[PDB]
mmCIF file of C-alpha atoms in Angstrom:
data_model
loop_
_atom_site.group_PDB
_atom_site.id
_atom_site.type_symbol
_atom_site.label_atom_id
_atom_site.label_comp_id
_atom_site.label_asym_id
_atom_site.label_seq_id
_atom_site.Cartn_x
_atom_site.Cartn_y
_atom_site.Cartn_z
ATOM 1 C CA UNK X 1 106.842 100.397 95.742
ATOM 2 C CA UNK X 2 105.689 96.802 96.301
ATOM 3 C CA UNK X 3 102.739 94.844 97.290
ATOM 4 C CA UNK X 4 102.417 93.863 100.603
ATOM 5 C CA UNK X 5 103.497 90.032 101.238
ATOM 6 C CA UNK X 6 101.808 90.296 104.394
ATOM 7 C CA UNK X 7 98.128 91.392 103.777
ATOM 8 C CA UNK X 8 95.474 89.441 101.949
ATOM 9 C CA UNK X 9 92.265 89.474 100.645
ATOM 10 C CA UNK X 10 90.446 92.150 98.061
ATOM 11 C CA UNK X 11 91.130 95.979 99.149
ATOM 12 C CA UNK X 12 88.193 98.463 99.004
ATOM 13 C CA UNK X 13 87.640 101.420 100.736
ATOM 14 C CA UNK X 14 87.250 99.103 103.845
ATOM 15 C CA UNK X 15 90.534 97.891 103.581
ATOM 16 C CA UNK X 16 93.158 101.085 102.837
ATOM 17 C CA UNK X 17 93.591 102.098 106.445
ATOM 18 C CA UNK X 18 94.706 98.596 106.811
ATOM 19 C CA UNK X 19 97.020 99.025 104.058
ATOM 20 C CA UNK X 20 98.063 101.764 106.238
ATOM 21 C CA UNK X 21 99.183 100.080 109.351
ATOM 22 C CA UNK X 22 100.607 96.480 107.446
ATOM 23 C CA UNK X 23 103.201 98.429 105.445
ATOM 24 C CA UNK X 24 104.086 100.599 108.129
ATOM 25 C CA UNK X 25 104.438 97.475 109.959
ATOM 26 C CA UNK X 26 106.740 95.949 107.273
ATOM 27 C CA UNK X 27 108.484 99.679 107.987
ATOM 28 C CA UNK X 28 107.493 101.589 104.516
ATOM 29 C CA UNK X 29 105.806 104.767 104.347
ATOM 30 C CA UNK X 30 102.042 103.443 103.967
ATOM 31 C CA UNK X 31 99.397 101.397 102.128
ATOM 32 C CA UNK X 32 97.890 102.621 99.299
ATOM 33 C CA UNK X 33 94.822 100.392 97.687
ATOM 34 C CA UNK X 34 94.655 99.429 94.074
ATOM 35 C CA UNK X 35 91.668 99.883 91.414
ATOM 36 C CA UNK X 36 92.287 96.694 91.730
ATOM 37 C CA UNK X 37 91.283 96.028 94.714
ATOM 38 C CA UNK X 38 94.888 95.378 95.666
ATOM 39 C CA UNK X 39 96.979 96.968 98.949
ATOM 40 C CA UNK X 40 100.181 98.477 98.068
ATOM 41 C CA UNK X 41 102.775 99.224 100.223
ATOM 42 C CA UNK X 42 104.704 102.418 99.433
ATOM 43 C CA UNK X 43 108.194 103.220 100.330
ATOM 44 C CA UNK X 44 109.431 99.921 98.586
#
């Protein structure tokens, strides 16, 4: 999996969904936020 190079910002349960749409944008399976208030993209 990566990060996304496209989002920005922290990541908190606010910000997952968006994680969500901006990998499946990039065309992976989905966001996933970090602990670290981080989004992932999965499917990388």
């Amino acid at each position: 999996d990566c990060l996304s190079g496209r989002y920005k910002g922290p990541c908190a349960v606010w910000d997952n969904e968006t994680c969500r749409r901006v990998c499946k944008e990039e065309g992976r399976s989905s966001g996933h936020c970090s602990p670290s208030l981080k989004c992932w993209c999965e499917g990388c």
